[PDB]
C-alpha cells in the first residue's frame, strides 16, 4: 500500500495479510453466508459462530 514501512512489526507483508485475512471474511458474509446459513439451519447468532471460531484456527492470540 504505502512506500515507507519499517521491517519489524510489519514490513507491509504483515499489513497486506490483514487485508487478505478479512478478504476471506468480508464478502462471503454476503456471498456465501446465505449458502452456509441455509445448509447450517440456524440464525445470525450461529453464523458468526463459525467464522468466529475460524478466525482463531487454534491460536487465540
Curated annotation (Swiss-Prot):
Q: Where in the cell is it found?
A: Nucleus
* Changes after translation: Phosphorylated. Phosphorylation may directly or allosterically modify its function.
**Which residues constitute the signal peptide according to the record?**
none
Tell me the superkingdom of the source: Eukaryota
Task: Quote the DNA-binding region ranges, renumbered to this chain.
Answer: 3-61
Give the protein's function: This protein specifies the body segmentation pattern. It is required for the development of the central nervous system. Transcriptional regulator that represses activated promoters. Wg signaling operates by inactivating the SGG repression of EN autoactivation.
Instruction: Name the family the entry cites.
Output: Belongs to the engrailed homeobox family.
| Protein's name according to its UniProt entry | Segmentation polarity homeobox protein engrailed
Amino acid at each position: 500500500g504505502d512506500e515507507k514501512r519499517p521491517r519489524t512489526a510489519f514490513s507491509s507483508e504483515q499489513l497486506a495479510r490483514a487485508k487478505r485475512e478479512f478478504n476471506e471474511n468480508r464478502y462471503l458474509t454476503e456471498r456465501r453466508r446465505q449458502q452456509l446459513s441455509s445448509e447450517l439451519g440456524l440464525n445470525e447468532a450461529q453464523i458468526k459462530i463459525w467464522f468466529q471460531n475460524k478466525r482463531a484456527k487454534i491460536r487465540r492470540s
